[PDB]
Amino acid sequence: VGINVKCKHSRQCLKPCKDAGMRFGKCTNGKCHCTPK
């Protein structure tokens, strides 16, 4: 579930999550995490 991209805070993961077509986006486990609507 989600994508496989690095992150530095949290808001920087919303960019690739929203552009990938997912709804949620946050930095977790040192990586970008997204989930469906």
PDB file of all heavy atoms in Angstrom:
ATOM      1  N   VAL A   1       0.849  -1.226   0.000  1.00  0.00           N
ATOM      2  CA  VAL A   1       0.000   0.000   0.000  1.00  0.00           C
ATOM      3  C   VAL A   1       0.871   1.258   0.000  1.00  0.00           C
ATOM      4  O   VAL A   1       1.926   1.278   0.638  1.00  0.00           O
ATOM      5  CB  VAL A   1      -1.034  -0.006   1.150  1.00  0.00           C
ATOM      6  CG1 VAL A   1      -0.426   0.022   2.561  1.00  0.00           C
ATOM      7  CG2 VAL A   1      -2.038   1.149   1.034  1.00  0.00           C
ATOM      8  N   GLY A   2       0.465   2.300  -0.732  1.00  0.00           N
ATOM      9  CA  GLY A   2       1.218   3.558  -0.841  1.00  0.00           C
ATOM     10  C   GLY A   2       2.268   3.536  -1.958  1.00  0.00           C
ATOM     11  O   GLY A   2       2.074   2.897  -2.996  1.00  0.00           O
ATOM     12  N   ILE A   3       3.376   4.251  -1.743  1.00  0.00           N
ATOM     13  CA  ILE A   3       4.492   4.429  -2.696  1.00  0.00           C
ATOM     14  C   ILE A   3       5.854   4.186  -2.008  1.00  0.00           C
ATOM     15  O   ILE A   3       5.908   3.917  -0.807  1.00  0.00           O
ATOM     16  CB  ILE A   3       4.404   5.820  -3.384  1.00  0.00           C
ATOM     17  CG1 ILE A   3       4.675   6.987  -2.407  1.00  0.00           C
ATOM     18  CG2 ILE A   3       3.052   5.983  -4.109  1.00  0.00           C
ATOM     19  CD1 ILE A   3       4.566   8.369  -3.065  1.00  0.00           C
ATOM     20  N   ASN A   4       6.961   4.286  -2.756  1.00  0.00           N
ATOM     21  CA  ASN A   4       8.325   4.072  -2.252  1.00  0.00           C
ATOM     22  C   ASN A   4       9.236   5.265  -2.607  1.00  0.00           C
ATOM     23  O   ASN A   4       9.938   5.260  -3.620  1.00  0.00           O
ATOM     24  CB  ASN A   4       8.858   2.720  -2.763  1.00  0.00           C
ATOM     25  CG  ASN A   4      10.191   2.365  -2.119  1.00  0.00           C
ATOM     26  OD1 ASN A   4      10.299   2.163  -0.917  1.00  0.00           O
ATOM     27  ND2 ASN A   4      11.259   2.298  -2.881  1.00  0.00           N
ATOM     28  N   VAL A   5       9.184   6.309  -1.773  1.00  0.00           N
ATOM     29  CA  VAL A   5       9.896   7.594  -1.943  1.00  0.00           C
ATOM     30  C   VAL A   5      10.424   8.050  -0.577  1.00  0.00           C
ATOM     31  O   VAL A   5       9.764   7.810   0.436  1.00  0.00           O
ATOM     32  CB  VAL A   5       8.954   8.676  -2.532  1.00  0.00           C
ATOM     33  CG1 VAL A   5       9.729   9.914  -2.999  1.00  0.00           C
ATOM     34  CG2 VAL A   5       8.142   8.193  -3.742  1.00  0.00           C
ATOM     35  N   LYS A   6      11.594   8.700  -0.512  1.00  0.00           N
ATOM     36  CA  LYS A   6      12.107   9.289   0.743  1.00  0.00           C
ATOM     37  C   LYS A   6      11.317  10.543   1.164  1.00  0.00           C
ATOM     38  O   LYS A   6      10.593  11.140   0.365  1.00  0.00           O
ATOM     39  CB  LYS A   6      13.620   9.600   0.625  1.00  0.00           C
ATOM     40  CG  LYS A   6      14.406   9.001   1.808  1.00  0.00           C
ATOM     41  CD  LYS A   6      14.768   7.520   1.575  1.00  0.00           C
ATOM     42  CE  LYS A   6      16.173   7.409   0.948  1.00  0.00           C
ATOM     43  NZ  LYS A   6      16.230   6.451  -0.186  1.00  0.00           N
ATOM     44  N   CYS A   7      11.493  10.965   2.414  1.00  0.00           N
ATOM     45  CA  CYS A   7      10.926  12.196   2.972  1.00  0.00           C
ATOM     46  C   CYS A   7      11.828  12.801   4.065  1.00  0.00           C
ATOM     47  O   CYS A   7      12.691  12.118   4.625  1.00  0.00           O
ATOM     48  CB  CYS A   7       9.507  11.904   3.500  1.00  0.00           C
ATOM     49  SG  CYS A   7       9.342  10.453   4.581  1.00  0.00           S
ATOM     50  N   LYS A   8      11.618  14.092   4.366  1.00  0.00           N
ATOM     51  CA  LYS A   8      12.455  14.902   5.279  1.00  0.00           C
ATOM     52  C   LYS A   8      11.680  15.485   6.476  1.00  0.00           C
ATOM     53  O   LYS A   8      12.294  15.838   7.481  1.00  0.00           O
ATOM     54  CB  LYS A   8      13.129  16.004   4.435  1.00  0.00           C
ATOM     55  CG  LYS A   8      14.416  16.611   5.031  1.00  0.00           C
ATOM     56  CD  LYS A   8      15.538  16.625   3.976  1.00  0.00           C
ATOM     57  CE  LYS A   8      16.717  17.513   4.406  1.00  0.00           C
ATOM     58  NZ  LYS A   8      17.340  18.184   3.233  1.00  0.00           N
ATOM     59  N   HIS A   9      10.346  15.552   6.382  1.00  0.00           N
ATOM     60  CA  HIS A   9       9.438  16.040   7.432  1.00  0.00           C
ATOM     61  C   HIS A   9       8.079  15.309   7.408  1.00  0.00           C
ATOM     62  O   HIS A   9       7.850  14.427   8.233  1.00  0.00           O
ATOM     63  CB  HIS A   9       9.251  17.566   7.287  1.00  0.00           C
ATOM     64  CG  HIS A   9      10.277  18.378   8.034  1.00  0.00           C
ATOM     65  ND1 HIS A   9      10.199  18.743   9.358  1.00  0.00           N
ATOM     66  CD2 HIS A   9      11.439  18.903   7.533  1.00  0.00           C
ATOM     67  CE1 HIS A   9      11.288  19.473   9.655  1.00  0.00           C
ATOM     68  NE2 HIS A   9      12.077  19.602   8.570  1.00  0.00           N
ATOM     69  N   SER A  10       7.189  15.664   6.468  1.00  0.00           N
ATOM     70  CA  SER A  10       5.811  15.140   6.332  1.00  0.00           C
ATOM     71  C   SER A  10       5.082  15.768   5.132  1.00  0.00           C
ATOM     72  O   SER A  10       4.709  15.049   4.204  1.00  0.00           O
ATOM     73  CB  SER A  10       5.022  15.371   7.635  1.00  0.00           C
ATOM     74  OG  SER A  10       3.629  15.249   7.430  1.00  0.00           O
ATOM     75  N   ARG A  11       4.970  17.107   5.073  1.00  0.00           N
ATOM     76  CA  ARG A  11       4.340  17.837   3.944  1.00  0.00           C
ATOM     77  C   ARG A  11       4.990  17.559   2.583  1.00  0.00           C
ATOM     78  O   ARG A  11       4.309  17.592   1.561  1.00  0.00           O
ATOM     79  CB  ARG A  11       4.317  19.354   4.222  1.00  0.00           C
ATOM     80  CG  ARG A  11       3.168  19.752   5.166  1.00  0.00           C
ATOM     81  CD  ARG A  11       2.994  21.278   5.237  1.00  0.00           C
ATOM     82  NE  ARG A  11       4.164  21.960   5.831  1.00  0.00           N
ATOM     83  CZ  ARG A  11       4.416  22.146   7.116  1.00  0.00           C
ATOM     84  NH1 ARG A  11       3.621  21.708   8.052  1.00  0.00           N
ATOM     85  NH2 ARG A  11       5.487  22.784   7.491  1.00  0.00           N
ATOM     86  N   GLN A  12       6.280  17.216   2.563  1.00  0.00           N
ATOM     87  CA  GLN A  12       6.999  16.849   1.332  1.00  0.00           C
ATOM     88  C   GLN A  12       6.517  15.519   0.720  1.00  0.00           C
ATOM     89  O   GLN A  12       6.745  15.278  -0.463  1.00  0.00           O
ATOM     90  CB  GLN A  12       8.524  16.800   1.557  1.00  0.00           C
ATOM     91  CG  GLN A  12       9.071  17.897   2.496  1.00  0.00           C
ATOM     92  CD  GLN A  12      10.572  18.174   2.345  1.00  0.00           C
ATOM     93  OE1 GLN A  12      11.066  19.223   2.736  1.00  0.00           O
ATOM     94  NE2 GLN A  12      11.370  17.275   1.799  1.00  0.00           N
ATOM     95  N   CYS A  13       5.840  14.665   1.501  1.00  0.00           N
ATOM     96  CA  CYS A  13       5.212  13.423   1.034  1.00  0.00           C
ATOM     97  C   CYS A  13       3.799  13.649   0.452  1.00  0.00           C
ATOM     98  O   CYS A  13       3.375  12.905  -0.433  1.00  0.00           O
ATOM     99  CB  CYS A  13       5.201  12.425   2.204  1.00  0.00           C
ATOM    100  SG  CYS A  13       4.329  10.867   1.910  1.00  0.00           S
ATOM    101  N   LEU A  14       3.079  14.707   0.854  1.00  0.00           N
ATOM    102  CA  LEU A  14       1.788  15.053   0.239  1.00  0.00           C
ATOM    103  C   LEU A  14       1.908  15.348  -1.268  1.00  0.00           C
ATOM    104  O   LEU A  14       1.048  14.893  -2.020  1.00  0.00           O
ATOM    105  CB  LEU A  14       1.104  16.223   0.980  1.00  0.00           C
ATOM    106  CG  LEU A  14       0.237  15.798   2.179  1.00  0.00           C
ATOM    107  CD1 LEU A  14      -0.249  17.044   2.921  1.00  0.00           C
ATOM    108  CD2 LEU A  14      -1.010  15.013   1.749  1.00  0.00           C
ATOM    109  N   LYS A  15       2.976  16.028  -1.721  1.00  0.00           N
ATOM    110  CA  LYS A  15       3.263  16.252  -3.156  1.00  0.00           C
ATOM    111  C   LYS A  15       3.211  14.944  -3.980  1.00  0.00           C
ATOM    112  O   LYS A  15       2.323  14.827  -4.831  1.00  0.00           O
ATOM    113  CB  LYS A  15       4.613  16.986  -3.359  1.00  0.00           C
ATOM    114  CG  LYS A  15       4.538  18.468  -3.757  1.00  0.00           C
ATOM    115  CD  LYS A  15       4.264  19.446  -2.604  1.00  0.00           C
ATOM    116  CE  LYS A  15       4.743  20.839  -3.056  1.00  0.00           C
ATOM    117  NZ  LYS A  15       4.056  21.941  -2.338  1.00  0.00           N
ATOM    118  N   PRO A  16       4.092  13.945  -3.739  1.00  0.00           N
ATOM    119  CA  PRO A  16       4.093  12.701  -4.505  1.00  0.00           C
ATOM    120  C   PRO A  16       2.860  11.826  -4.235  1.00  0.00           C
ATOM    121  O   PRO A  16       2.375  11.200  -5.175  1.00  0.00           O
ATOM    122  CB  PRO A  16       5.413  11.997  -4.164  1.00  0.00           C
ATOM    123  CG  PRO A  16       5.764  12.533  -2.782  1.00  0.00           C
ATOM    124  CD  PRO A  16       5.238  13.963  -2.841  1.00  0.00           C
ATOM    125  N   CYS A  17       2.291  11.810  -3.018  1.00  0.00           N
ATOM    126  CA  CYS A  17       1.054  11.061  -2.754  1.00  0.00           C
ATOM    127  C   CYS A  17      -0.143  11.563  -3.576  1.00  0.00           C
ATOM    128  O   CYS A  17      -0.834  10.761  -4.212  1.00  0.00           O
ATOM    129  CB  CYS A  17       0.698  11.116  -1.263  1.00  0.00           C
ATOM    130  SG  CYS A  17       1.707  10.075  -0.183  1.00  0.00           S
ATOM    131  N   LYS A  18      -0.388  12.881  -3.590  1.00  0.00           N
ATOM    132  CA  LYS A  18      -1.515  13.469  -4.328  1.00  0.00           C
ATOM    133  C   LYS A  18      -1.332  13.312  -5.840  1.00  0.00           C
ATOM    134  O   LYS A  18      -2.265  12.927  -6.544  1.00  0.00           O
ATOM    135  CB  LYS A  18      -1.694  14.948  -3.934  1.00  0.00           C
ATOM    136  CG  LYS A  18      -3.175  15.359  -3.956  1.00  0.00           C
ATOM    137  CD  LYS A  18      -3.320  16.889  -3.920  1.00  0.00           C
ATOM    138  CE  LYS A  18      -4.729  17.304  -3.468  1.00  0.00           C
ATOM    139  NZ  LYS A  18      -4.725  17.850  -2.085  1.00  0.00           N
ATOM    140  N   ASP A  19      -0.112  13.535  -6.335  1.00  0.00           N
ATOM    141  CA  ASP A  19       0.240  13.380  -7.753  1.00  0.00           C
ATOM    142  C   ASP A  19       0.186  11.913  -8.241  1.00  0.00           C
ATOM    143  O   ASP A  19      -0.176  11.663  -9.392  1.00  0.00           O
ATOM    144  CB  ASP A  19       1.624  13.999  -7.992  1.00  0.00           C
ATOM    145  CG  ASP A  19       1.961  14.086  -9.490  1.00  0.00           C
ATOM    146  OD1 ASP A  19       1.349  14.922 -10.200  1.00  0.00           O
ATOM    147  OD2 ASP A  19       2.857  13.345  -9.958  1.00  0.00           O
ATOM    148  N   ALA A  20       0.470  10.938  -7.366  1.00  0.00           N
ATOM    149  CA  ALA A  20       0.288   9.506  -7.634  1.00  0.00           C
ATOM    150  C   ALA A  20      -1.191   9.067  -7.749  1.00  0.00           C
ATOM    151  O   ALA A  20      -1.471   7.985  -8.272  1.00  0.00           O
ATOM    152  CB  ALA A  20       0.998   8.701  -6.535  1.00  0.00           C
ATOM    153  N   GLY A  21      -2.136   9.886  -7.269  1.00  0.00           N
ATOM    154  CA  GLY A  21      -3.581   9.621  -7.307  1.00  0.00           C
ATOM    155  C   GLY A  21      -4.183   9.137  -5.977  1.00  0.00           C
ATOM    156  O   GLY A  21      -5.391   8.892  -5.908  1.00  0.00           O
ATOM    157  N   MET A  22      -3.371   8.990  -4.925  1.00  0.00           N
ATOM    158  CA  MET A  22      -3.820   8.648  -3.565  1.00  0.00           C
ATOM    159  C   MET A  22      -4.414   9.869  -2.832  1.00  0.00           C
ATOM    160  O   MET A  22      -4.280  11.011  -3.284  1.00  0.00           O
ATOM    161  CB  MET A  22      -2.653   8.030  -2.769  1.00  0.00           C
ATOM    162  CG  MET A  22      -2.428   6.549  -3.108  1.00  0.00           C
ATOM    163  SD  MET A  22      -1.707   6.194  -4.734  1.00  0.00           S
ATOM    164  CE  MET A  22      -1.795   4.383  -4.696  1.00  0.00           C
ATOM    165  N   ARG A  23      -5.075   9.633  -1.685  1.00  0.00           N
ATOM    166  CA  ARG A  23      -5.753  10.679  -0.893  1.00  0.00           C
ATOM    167  C   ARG A  23      -4.888  11.172   0.268  1.00  0.00           C
ATOM    168  O   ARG A  23      -4.505  12.343   0.292  1.00  0.00           O
ATOM    169  CB  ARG A  23      -7.134  10.161  -0.442  1.00  0.00           C
ATOM    170  CG  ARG A  23      -7.785  11.049   0.638  1.00  0.00           C
ATOM    171  CD  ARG A  23      -9.319  10.946   0.644  1.00  0.00           C
ATOM    172  NE  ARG A  23      -9.869  10.822   2.009  1.00  0.00           N
ATOM    173  CZ  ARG A  23     -10.008  11.781   2.908  1.00  0.00           C
ATOM    174  NH1 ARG A  23      -9.628  13.008   2.685  1.00  0.00           N
ATOM    175  NH2 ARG A  23     -10.544  11.521   4.067  1.00  0.00           N
ATOM    176  N   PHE A  24      -4.580  10.297   1.223  1.00  0.00           N
ATOM    177  CA  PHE A  24      -3.689  10.618   2.342  1.00  0.00           C
ATOM    178  C   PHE A  24      -2.221  10.664   1.896  1.00  0.00           C
ATOM    179  O   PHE A  24      -1.841  10.059   0.889  1.00  0.00           O
ATOM    180  CB  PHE A  24      -3.880   9.579   3.457  1.00  0.00           C
ATOM    181  CG  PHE A  24      -5.009   9.895   4.417  1.00  0.00           C
ATOM    182  CD1 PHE A  24      -6.259   9.257   4.292  1.00  0.00           C
ATOM    183  CD2 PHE A  24      -4.799  10.820   5.460  1.00  0.00           C
ATOM    184  CE1 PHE A  24      -7.290   9.543   5.208  1.00  0.00           C
ATOM    185  CE2 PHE A  24      -5.830  11.106   6.373  1.00  0.00           C
ATOM    186  CZ  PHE A  24      -7.077  10.466   6.248  1.00  0.00           C
ATOM    187  N   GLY A  25      -1.388  11.334   2.695  1.00  0.00           N
ATOM    188  CA  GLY A  25       0.063  11.357   2.524  1.00  0.00           C
ATOM    189  C   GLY A  25       0.785  11.818   3.789  1.00  0.00           C
ATOM    190  O   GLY A  25       0.491  12.898   4.302  1.00  0.00           O
ATOM    191  N   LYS A  26       1.725  11.009   4.291  1.00  0.00           N
ATOM    192  CA  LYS A  26       2.595  11.360   5.427  1.00  0.00           C
ATOM    193  C   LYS A  26       3.934  10.620   5.391  1.00  0.00           C
ATOM    194  O   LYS A  26       4.034   9.514   4.866  1.00  0.00           O
ATOM    195  CB  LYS A  26       1.877  11.072   6.769  1.00  0.00           C
ATOM    196  CG  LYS A  26       2.033  12.283   7.704  1.00  0.00           C
ATOM    197  CD  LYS A  26       1.869  11.934   9.189  1.00  0.00           C
ATOM    198  CE  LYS A  26       2.121  13.213  10.004  1.00  0.00           C
ATOM    199  NZ  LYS A  26       2.157  12.945  11.463  1.00  0.00           N
ATOM    200  N   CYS A  27       4.959  11.211   5.999  1.00  0.00           N
ATOM    201  CA  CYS A  27       6.245  10.554   6.240  1.00  0.00           C
ATOM    202  C   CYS A  27       6.118   9.589   7.439  1.00  0.00           C
ATOM    203  O   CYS A  27       5.801  10.016   8.553  1.00  0.00           O
ATOM    204  CB  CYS A  27       7.295  11.654   6.470  1.00  0.00           C
ATOM    205  SG  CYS A  27       9.038  11.157   6.464  1.00  0.00           S
ATOM    206  N   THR A  28       6.352   8.292   7.217  1.00  0.00           N
ATOM    207  CA  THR A  28       6.334   7.228   8.242  1.00  0.00           C
ATOM    208  C   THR A  28       7.466   6.231   7.990  1.00  0.00           C
ATOM    209  O   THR A  28       7.843   6.002   6.843  1.00  0.00           O
ATOM    210  CB  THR A  28       4.973   6.504   8.274  1.00  0.00           C
ATOM    211  OG1 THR A  28       4.826   5.859   9.521  1.00  0.00           O
ATOM    212  CG2 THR A  28       4.791   5.434   7.192  1.00  0.00           C
ATOM    213  N   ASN A  29       8.030   5.620   9.035  1.00  0.00           N
ATOM    214  CA  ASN A  29       9.161   4.681   8.925  1.00  0.00           C
ATOM    215  C   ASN A  29      10.355   5.215   8.074  1.00  0.00           C
ATOM    216  O   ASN A  29      11.067   4.446   7.421  1.00  0.00           O
ATOM    217  CB  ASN A  29       8.588   3.330   8.436  1.00  0.00           C
ATOM    218  CG  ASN A  29       9.522   2.145   8.644  1.00  0.00           C
ATOM    219  OD1 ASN A  29      10.329   2.093   9.564  1.00  0.00           O
ATOM    220  ND2 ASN A  29       9.417   1.132   7.811  1.00  0.00           N
ATOM    221  N   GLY A  30      10.546   6.543   8.028  1.00  0.00           N
ATOM    222  CA  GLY A  30      11.557   7.226   7.201  1.00  0.00           C
ATOM    223  C   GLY A  30      11.259   7.276   5.689  1.00  0.00           C
ATOM    224  O   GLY A  30      12.175   7.499   4.893  1.00  0.00           O
ATOM    225  N   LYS A  31      10.001   7.058   5.281  1.00  0.00           N
ATOM    226  CA  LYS A  31       9.537   6.952   3.885  1.00  0.00           C
ATOM    227  C   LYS A  31       8.142   7.548   3.695  1.00  0.00           C
ATOM    228  O   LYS A  31       7.359   7.691   4.630  1.00  0.00           O
ATOM    229  CB  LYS A  31       9.545   5.463   3.471  1.00  0.00           C
ATOM    230  CG  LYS A  31      10.730   5.161   2.530  1.00  0.00           C
ATOM    231  CD  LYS A  31      11.239   3.717   2.688  1.00  0.00           C
ATOM    232  CE  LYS A  31      12.731   3.627   2.336  1.00  0.00           C
ATOM    233  NZ  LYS A  31      12.965   3.608   0.871  1.00  0.00           N
ATOM    234  N   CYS A  32       7.825   7.922   2.465  1.00  0.00           N
ATOM    235  CA  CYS A  32       6.516   8.448   2.118  1.00  0.00           C
ATOM    236  C   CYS A  32       5.465   7.324   2.088  1.00  0.00           C
ATOM    237  O   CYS A  32       5.659   6.293   1.441  1.00  0.00           O
ATOM    238  CB  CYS A  32       6.633   9.174   0.774  1.00  0.00           C
ATOM    239  SG  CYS A  32       5.151  10.057   0.234  1.00  0.00           S
ATOM    240  N   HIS A  33       4.347   7.540   2.776  1.00  0.00           N
ATOM    241  CA  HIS A  33       3.207   6.631   2.874  1.00  0.00           C
ATOM    242  C   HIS A  33       1.946   7.367   2.426  1.00  0.00           C
ATOM    243  O   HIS A  33       1.690   8.495   2.849  1.00  0.00           O
ATOM    244  CB  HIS A  33       3.083   6.128   4.324  1.00  0.00           C
ATOM    245  CG  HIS A  33       1.674   5.896   4.824  1.00  0.00           C
ATOM    246  ND1 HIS A  33       0.806   4.898   4.445  1.00  0.00           N
ATOM    247  CD2 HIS A  33       1.014   6.683   5.732  1.00  0.00           C
ATOM    248  CE1 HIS A  33      -0.351   5.081   5.105  1.00  0.00           C
ATOM    249  NE2 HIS A  33      -0.272   6.156   5.910  1.00  0.00           N
ATOM    250  N   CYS A  34       1.146   6.689   1.608  1.00  0.00           N
ATOM    251  CA  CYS A  34      -0.137   7.158   1.094  1.00  0.00           C
ATOM    252  C   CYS A  34      -1.187   6.045   1.245  1.00  0.00           C
ATOM    253  O   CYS A  34      -0.835   4.867   1.369  1.00  0.00           O
ATOM    254  CB  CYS A  34       0.000   7.535  -0.395  1.00  0.00           C
ATOM    255  SG  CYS A  34       1.574   8.216  -0.977  1.00  0.00           S
ATOM    256  N   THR A  35      -2.466   6.396   1.147  1.00  0.00           N
ATOM    257  CA  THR A  35      -3.589   5.440   1.203  1.00  0.00           C
ATOM    258  C   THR A  35      -4.743   5.891   0.293  1.00  0.00           C
ATOM    259  O   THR A  35      -4.847   7.085  -0.026  1.00  0.00           O
ATOM    260  CB  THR A  35      -4.097   5.208   2.653  1.00  0.00           C
ATOM    261  OG1 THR A  35      -3.708   6.227   3.550  1.00  0.00           O
ATOM    262  CG2 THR A  35      -3.551   3.905   3.242  1.00  0.00           C
ATOM    263  N   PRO A  36      -5.600   4.956  -0.169  1.00  0.00           N
ATOM    264  CA  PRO A  36      -6.722   5.261  -1.057  1.00  0.00           C
ATOM    265  C   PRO A  36      -7.836   6.038  -0.332  1.00  0.00           C
ATOM    266  O   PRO A  36      -7.870   6.115   0.902  1.00  0.00           O
ATOM    267  CB  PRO A  36      -7.211   3.899  -1.568  1.00  0.00           C
ATOM    268  CG  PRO A  36      -6.876   2.950  -0.423  1.00  0.00           C
ATOM    269  CD  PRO A  36      -5.572   3.525   0.126  1.00  0.00           C
ATOM    270  N   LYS A  37      -8.752   6.623  -1.115  1.00  0.00           N
ATOM    271  CA  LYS A  37      -9.929   7.350  -0.611  1.00  0.00           C
ATOM    272  C   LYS A  37     -10.935   6.459   0.147  1.00  0.00           C
ATOM    273  O   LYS A  37     -11.544   6.966   1.119  1.00  0.00           O
ATOM    274  CB  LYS A  37     -10.588   8.183  -1.737  1.00  0.00           C
ATOM    275  CG  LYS A  37     -11.125   7.364  -2.929  1.00  0.00           C
ATOM    276  CD  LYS A  37     -10.255   7.415  -4.196  1.00  0.00           C
ATOM    277  CE  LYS A  37     -10.717   8.528  -5.151  1.00  0.00           C
ATOM    278  NZ  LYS A  37     -10.387   8.208  -6.565  1.00  0.00           N
TER     279      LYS A  37
END
